[PDB]
Amino acid sequence: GNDCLGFWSACNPKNDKCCANLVCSSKHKWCKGKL
Numbered sequence: 355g356n357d358c359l360g361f362w363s364a365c366n367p368k369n370d371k372c373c374a375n376l377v378c379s380s381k382h383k384w385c386k387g388k389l
Contacts, residue, residue, distance in 0.1 A: 358374075359376070359385050360372075362373075362385060363376075363385040364384050365383065365384060365389070375388075376388070379382060
């Protein structure tokens with residue numbers, strides 16, 4: 355079914371597949387918390 359990533363999980367700035375409403379930092383390139 356669904357598929358997402360956790361926290362501090364590497365991802366793509368063009369395709370954010372993070373969970374918990376996380377954010378894919380285009381800098382660190384990971385699922386961080388949108389401040």
